Amino acid sequence: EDSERRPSCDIDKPPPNIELTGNGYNELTGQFRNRVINTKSFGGQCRK
Amino acid sequence: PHYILNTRFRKPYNVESYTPQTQGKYEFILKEYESYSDFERNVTEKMAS
Fold first, then answer.
1. What is the distance between the alpha carbons of residues B47 and B49, in angstroms, rounded to a whole number?
2. Between which residues do disulfide bridges form (chain A)?
């Protein structure tokens, strides 16, 4: 409830569709695959 | 947080990932064909004796 350090320092949005960047890739079928790497992480380190 | 077209969305617990993909391909095949045919035969014969 008492959120210290002003979470996210008033930063609103990530890149538009980084979820597609998190998605996998297939080579022999040319069709993409599911999200594997959680690019939506932040590690606390707000990079503005 | 989830962002789609400058709009903040919610991902439910059952959906793994819902990402908008462009993936656009259209095909347009038009056909044109015409055929003409004409025939005419004039025949005239006269005999007098």
1. 7
2. 9-46
